[PDB]
Amino acid sequence: ANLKEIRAKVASIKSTQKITRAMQMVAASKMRRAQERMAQGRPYADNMRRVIAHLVQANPEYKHRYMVDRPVKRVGYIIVSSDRGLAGGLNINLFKKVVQHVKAQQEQSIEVQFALIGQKAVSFFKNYGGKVLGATTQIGDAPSLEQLTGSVQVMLDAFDKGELDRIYLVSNGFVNAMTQKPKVEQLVPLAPAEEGDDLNRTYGWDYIYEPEAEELLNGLLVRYIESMVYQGVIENVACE
Amino acid sequence: IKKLSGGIRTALAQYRELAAFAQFASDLDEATRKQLEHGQRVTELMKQKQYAPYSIADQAVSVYASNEGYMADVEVKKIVDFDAALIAYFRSEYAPLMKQIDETGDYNKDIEAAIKAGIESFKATQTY
Amino acid sequence: ATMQCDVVSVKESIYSGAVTMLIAKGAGGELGILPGHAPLVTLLQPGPIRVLLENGTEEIVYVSGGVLEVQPHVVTVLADTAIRADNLDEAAILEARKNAEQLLANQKSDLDSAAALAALAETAAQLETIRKIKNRAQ
Amino acid sequence: QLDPLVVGQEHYEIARAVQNVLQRYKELKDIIAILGMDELAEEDKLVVYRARKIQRFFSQPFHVAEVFTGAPGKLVPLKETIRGFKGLLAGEYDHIPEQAFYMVGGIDEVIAKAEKL
Amino acid sequence: QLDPLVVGQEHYEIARAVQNVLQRYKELKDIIAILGMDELAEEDKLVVYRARKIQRFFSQPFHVAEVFTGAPGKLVPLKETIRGFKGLLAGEYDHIPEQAFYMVGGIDEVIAKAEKL
């Protein structure tokens, strides 16, 4: 029978369930706190989009590479995930979808290059092998601008040499407080999206630039894509 | 005793409800943190030695001091020493009030004002 | 007249107020701001930004590089890293935030491990020796 | 009779492997139940699927049970049983759904039922 | 018999503090096995050395036994043990190597060992 140990085991299970629900409250509090950073990433992108829209409208003579498309033979991927486990089926379903995507790409006789963020992702990607271009770990609650330069830097310096053509991103879609849908969108082959603005309200004047506009423009694109990576990372943290 | 027991009752209840939150103490909200601190302080206040038959005067003084947050600043480790020193100082200095309380057990505005004034005095004159 | 001075960074916008005088240090060097100026964009050297309000009160913010944008109706300066430049250096201030982040990460990892890995395994350790003996009569 | 001197080496190894897999799945059941299934190791997922298919494959329609179910009975020689279990433990049928292993005869009937599905 | 009135207040304080330090040593092993000492820097390591010497200090050679010692007396009074534990808790012997605490009776003996090595 061992009845005494039955009451002891019941008490232990009750205590562990209580601490489990307490950890649930802590996770909810962290989720809310992270959700509070959902709004501040957009104004930077808005201003950057406005200024480059004016820049291309005023000087529509040089078609730069970062918003043009050429025949595709190589692509790049970016993965952001968790540093530990017990985060639900988020990372594993995300990786199932991305492996389906790359398998679909494989039939076109094109391979992939990628560098990721997360211990689980490096572990599971090394458990099956592939081509990696960097690694990161131990980011925690607060990612920084400096902590997330390596991945975007390697993507940029790989694309600028013509090795790569298009770069996607892989994250989780925080549809609302308790939903999730994975997403995949391009970053580097910047396609014209919502570019009809600033046309009807065009300005007959133009800004003056002490240097040539090229360095300013490509610095602006760099600003845009670091905002992309920052927004994706914080959105994934909030969803996770 | 009847009019002062409710504070310790609710304090112990709220401390027992959230006893599992005493392992983080890092990012919990302000109300929960204050409740945890007060629960720890009151549960350390109930510490009692042996062969120390407290009367009702010192019990009332200690309970009233704990109720109004007049012992919050005291470190949890030295709560027993602070309580004992406060009781001893009150016994040495404020004897007539103790005799009146022990004899009748009545409550009044005057008694509460005198007890609070004595606690405010002890906050500075005597060091534990 | 004054002019709303919007400062924005990738992480956060720390100041946005109406100011009158803005002295900036671009690629050429130091250059001030007056109303009605021709709009322009200019790379800013890794130094601080100095402004004086209408009453003369000064606001000092650090920028470690960025492109300027000033025009008579709107003023906005974008910075990769920016914070109030009470000194010529900010490492001694940012190290406190670094310590806070590292400590929070370490404590969170410890809490997660202790709460989950030990407790759930301990609960799941022994359950079948009782289920297998439910119908026993001894 | 279950010793290698009486029934041969292959039979003994097949039986021992089957029993080991079943025991491992029975061990994993509790942590699968109270917690999720994602946190398991990949080998544990393979063990779970193989064990479920194994306990599916041990069912058989009888001749004297035709009144209860209405299906004709089947008789299986032990050579086909050993073949099927060795193939199952090897991993050749890791893509077959576990519904195709229910109330059949040999592994050929399993293949036919899976294809018809 | 650990009443502070009869055993002595210092005895009570030292015993309780030593037991709590040993408990702190006991809890650290699981966290070390999970994460390591990356978290534990400037904290919980001092407890590690202190409880290491505390555990080694309980060792004592035995008079009747002759296989591992030459019948040493080692019948030190209580006062020696309490004084040594108080000194070790305070931290004067914190810098002393932990491996000099094995098979030692008194503080003078471990001091002689430490100056010997």
Swiss-Prot record, chain A:
Membrane topology type: Peripheral membrane protein
Molecular function, one GO term: proton-transporting ATP synthase activity, rotational mechanism
Record keywords: Iron included?
no
Q: Which domain of life is it from?
A: Bacteria
What GO terms fall under cellular component here? plasma membrane; proton-transporting ATP synthase complex
Q: Does the keyword Phosphoprotein apply?
A: no
A single GO BP term for this record reads: proton motive force-driven plasma membrane ATP synthesis
Protein keywords: ATP synthesis, Cell inner membrane, Cell membrane, CF(1), Hydrogen ion transport, Ion transport, Membrane, Transport
Give its localization: Cell inner membrane
Disulfide pairs here are none
**Function comment:** Produces ATP from ADP in the presence of a proton gradient across the membrane. The gamma chain is believed to be important in regulating ATPase activity and the flow of protons through the CF(0) complex.
Subunit composition and interactions: F-type ATPases have 2 components, CF(1) - the catalytic core - and CF(0) - the membrane proton channel. CF(1) has five subunits: alpha(3), beta(3), gamma(1), delta(1), epsilon(1). CF(0) has three main subunits: a, b and c.
Q: Which family does it belong to?
A: Belongs to the ATPase gamma chain family.
Tell me what this protein is called: ATP synthase gamma chain
Which organism was this protein described from?
Acinetobacter baumannii (strain ATCC 17978 / DSM 105126 / CIP 53.77 / LMG 1025 / NCDC KC755 / 5377)
Tell me the name of the encoding gene.
atpG
Which part of the entire protein is covered?
2 to 241 of 289
Curated annotation (Swiss-Prot), chain B:
Q: Which gene encodes it?
A: atpA
Record function comment? Produces ATP from ADP in the presence of a proton gradient across the membrane. The alpha chain is a regulatory subunit.
- Top-rank taxon: Bacteria
Q: Which species?
A: Acinetobacter baumannii (strain ATCC 17978 / DSM 105126 / CIP 53.77 / LMG 1025 / NCDC KC755 / 5377)
Q: How does it assemble?
A: F-type ATPases have 2 components, CF(1) - the catalytic core - and CF(0) - the membrane proton channel. CF(1) has five subunits: alpha(3), beta(3), gamma(1), delta(1), epsilon(1). CF(0) has three main subunits: a(1), b(2) and c(9-12). The alpha and beta chains form an alternating ring which encloses part of the gamma chain. CF(1) is attached to CF(0) by a central stalk formed by the gamma and epsilon chains, while a peripheral stalk is formed by the delta and b chains.
Fragment boundaries within the full protein? 387 to 514 of 514
* Protein name as it appears in the record: ATP synthase subunit alpha
Family membership: Belongs to the ATPase alpha/beta chains family.
The record lists the membrane-crossing segments as none
Q: Where in the cell is it found?
A: Cell inner membrane
User: Which cysteines link up through disulfide bonds?
Assistant: none
UniProtKB/Swiss-Prot annotation, chain C:
Looking up SUPFAM superfamilies in the UniProt record yields: Epsilon subunit of F1F0-ATP synthase C-terminal domain, Epsilon subunit of F1F0-ATP synthase N-terminal domain
**How is this protein positioned relative to the membrane?**
Peripheral membrane protein
List where in the cell it is found.
Cell inner membrane
Output the InterPro entries linked to this UniProt entry: ATP_F1_dsu/esu_C_sf, ATP_synth_F1_dsu/esu, ATP_synth_F1_dsu/esu_N, ATPsynth_dsu/esu_N
Q: GO molecular-function annotation terms?
A: ATP binding; proton-transporting ATP synthase activity, rotational mechanism
Metal-binding in keyword set: no
Q: What is its main location?
A: membrane
The UniProt entry's GO CC annotations, sorted and at most eight, read: plasma membrane; proton-transporting ATP synthase complex
Gene3D superfamilies, A to Z: ATP synthase delta/epsilon subunit, C-terminal domain, F0F1 ATP synthase delta/epsilon subunit, N-terminal
Q: Which UniProt keywords apply?
A: ATP synthesis, Cell inner membrane, Cell membrane, CF(1), Hydrogen ion transport, Ion transport, Membrane, Transport
Q: Relate the assembly described in the record.
A: F-type ATPases have 2 components, CF(1) - the catalytic core - and CF(0) - the membrane proton channel. CF(1) has five subunits: alpha(3), beta(3), gamma(1), delta(1), epsilon(1). CF(0) has three main subunits: a, b and c.
The role this protein plays is:
Produces ATP from ADP in the presence of a proton gradient across the membrane.
Name the family: Belongs to the ATPase epsilon chain family.
Q: Which HAMAP family match?
A: ATP_synth_epsil_bac
This protein is called ATP synthase epsilon chain
Q: Which taxonomic lineage is given here? A: Bacteria, Pseudomonadati, Pseudomonadota, Gammaproteobacteria, Moraxellales
**What gene is this protein translated from?**
atpC
Swiss-Prot record, chains D, E:
**In which compartments does the protein localize?**
Cell inner membrane
- Superkingdom to which the source organism belongs: Bacteria
Where does the record place a coiled coil?
none
Name the family the entry cites: Belongs to the ATPase alpha/beta chains family.
Its function, per the record, reads: Produces ATP from ADP in the presence of a proton gradient across the membrane. The catalytic sites are hosted primarily by the beta subunits.
Quaternary structure, per UniProt, is: F-type ATPases have 2 components, CF(1) - the catalytic core - and CF(0) - the membrane proton channel. CF(1) has five subunits: alpha(3), beta(3), gamma(1), delta(1), epsilon(1). CF(0) has three main subunits: a(1), b(2) and c(9-12). The alpha and beta chains form an alternating ring which encloses part of the gamma chain. CF(1) is attached to CF(0) by a central stalk formed by the gamma and epsilon chains, while a peripheral stalk is formed by the delta and b chains.
Specify the protein name. Answer: ATP synthase subunit beta
Species the sequence originates in: Acinetobacter baumannii (strain ATCC 17978 / DSM 105126 / CIP 53.77 / LMG 1025 / NCDC KC755 / 5377)
> What are the leading ranks of the lineage?
Bacteria, Pseudomonadati, Pseudomonadota, Gammaproteobacteria, Moraxellales
**Which region of the full protein is contained in this chain?**
348 to 464 of 464
